[PDB]
Structures are given as structure tokens and as C-alpha cells.
Structure 1
Amino acid sequence: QRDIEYSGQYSKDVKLAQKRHKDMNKLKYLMTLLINNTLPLPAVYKDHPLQGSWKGYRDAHVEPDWILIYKLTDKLLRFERTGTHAALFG
């Protein structure tokens, strides 16, 4: 079992999503899949390595404009950020 972590930024991003009335079940379900070692993820998540040279970092789509950024190694799963393309890349 991978150790589970989340960043301080991740906590702020989930609070913002909550405030924006996003459907938190979509995000929670995806988080559970990752925690449960469901890899590769179902195709609907369009999961892929994060753009750039950040080792082990990946990018999954909860919705077309709701992204989860996380790091995944054999020992570790860390939830890093979540939000729109504008919030994460813009």
C-alpha cells in the first residue's frame, strides 16, 4: 500500500471547489480509485504525465475543465492540486 499525502495547496484547492459548488463525489471517487491502486485509471479520466519535467507527477481529468494533479510512485501517492486549467496552468 502506497503512503497517502496531500499538500497544503491541495487543501486550499478542495475548499475552493467546495465553495464553487463543484460535485465533490466526482473528485472523491477518483481519489479513491488512486488510493485503491486502480491503475491504469479508467480511460474517461484521460490520465497522463504532467507537462514538464516533474518526476512521477500526473494529471487526470475529473471533468474537461477540472484537473487533479498528483504524484504517484511505488511508495507514495500525493494529492498536489486541483482546479480549472486557468487555476493550474493559466
Structure 2
Amino acid sequence: IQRDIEYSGQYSKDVKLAQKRHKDMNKLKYLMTLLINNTLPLPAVYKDHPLQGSWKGYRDAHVEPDWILIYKLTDKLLRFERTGTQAALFG
């Protein structure tokens, strides 16, 4: 068993929008690299935690106070699911 890396179609759109809105993409890249490299658990600054409701099975890390990464992590997969504001991702 080797864990894969996945990106939802929506994730790619979300990343393009973050770029367009002048977010500091290096901050998202750093977080993604920690996950990809299995340098886990993440440090406390990300406030990483599991989600419920429609996002049950996924996790929530804060890149910034209003910039969230939603991802799934199992033994088999790491999937980057969405990124953006809390309102966009949860509202």
C-alpha cells in the first residue's frame, strides 16, 4: 500500500481563484508540502481538525484566519478537496 496524492477538480479552480485574488500562494504550498511529505502531525498554527456535516470524513486546516484548506487523509490517499474562505467552503 502506497498513499497517493489527489486533487479534486474543484481544488484546481479554487487554487486559480486564490491566485487571482492575490493570496500568498507560498503559504498554501508550504502546508500542502507538509501533507504530501507526511510531515505529520501538522504544527498547531494550522488549527488542524476533522470536519462534520456535509464535510464528514474530511479535515480543515487554516492557512490564514479566513483561508481554509479542506482535505482528506487516510492510509491510502491524500486528497486536496477545496480551498478558500470559510464562507465559500461552508456557507
Q: What SS does the aligned partner of 1:79 have?
A: strand
Structure 2 residues without counterparts, runs of 5 or longer: none
Alpha-carbon spacing, 1:84–1:54, altered in 2? closer, same or farther (3 Å) = closer
Offset of 1:55 from its aligned partner?
A: 5.1
% identical aligned pairs: 99
> TM-score if structure 1 supplies the norm length?
0.94
Q: Please provide the CA RMSD for this pair.
A: 1.3
Aligned 8 A contact 1:2 1:35 in 2: no
List structure 1 runs of 4+ shifted beyond 6 angstroms: none
Gaps of 5+ in 1: none
TM-score, structure 2 normalization? 0.93
The alignment covers a number of residue pairs equal to 90
Q: Any idea what the Cα deviations from partners look like across 1:17-66, whole Å, max 9, x if unmatched?
A: 00000000000000000001011100000000013275541000000100
